[PDB]
Amino acid sequence: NVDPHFDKFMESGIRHVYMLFENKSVESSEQFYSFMRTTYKNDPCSSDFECIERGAEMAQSYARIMNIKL
């Protein structure tokens, strides 16, 4: 009751989607880490409240730069 044909279809389909998305995941991982190190160095938080809070603000800014498609 376990389709050995749909299974190898999905495995191959999942693997190829993984491979196809490599350049995007790498690109956006690089840029996220750069973005967060840049925005920290250009205006470092000091206290816990400001560090957590700035973390949240720059998460939103990174998102807006990712809902804009570049």
Add this chain to the structure above:
Amino acid sequence: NVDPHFDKFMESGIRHVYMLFENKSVESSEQFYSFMRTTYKNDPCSSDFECIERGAEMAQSYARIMNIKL
């Protein structure tokens, strides 16, 4: 030599980006699985060669539907 202030900045920033991307990851995970079950049921592969090969073709089609932004 380990910045306890940049660390909590990044942790908060990573967590909030995780939360912000929830709806996208869920949406595209749902659709991927639906897309692959739909395209299998509407034209099932039979053999290993065709199952692997159709898996690769529909991976590309899913990608094209994801580089088009809807």
Add this chain to the structure above:
Amino acid sequence: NVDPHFDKFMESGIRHVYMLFENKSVESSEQFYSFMRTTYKNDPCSSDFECIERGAEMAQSYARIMNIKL
């Protein structure tokens, strides 16, 4: 003020971690989808409440099978 040497270090490091994790992401993606189709077919939810609720319960069961390391 942008280290062109740490950058290519990270890009290469991110790409190779992506490649190394391929078999795990594929394996656990396959099994998640199988697990969820199996547990649905062996006891299908009917209503919205039960569908959402069973979705949550089997998410926890999948997790327990993933905190056990097999």
Add this chain to the structure above:
Amino acid sequence: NVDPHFDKFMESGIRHVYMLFENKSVESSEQFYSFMRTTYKNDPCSSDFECIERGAEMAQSYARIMNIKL
């Protein structure tokens, strides 16, 4: 021909697995970035060849520290 009941089961199941994996994805994202900045600062690559190559070596070391389960 589109099961509106299995769909909401999967959506809920995918969302809850996303939520459950939050602490792991955050933890391992934090540590990856720290690990890679630490290993760069404690022995920086200089040239392209060494930067790409060290990137690959520390990807493997991060992996071994992740196949060991801590």
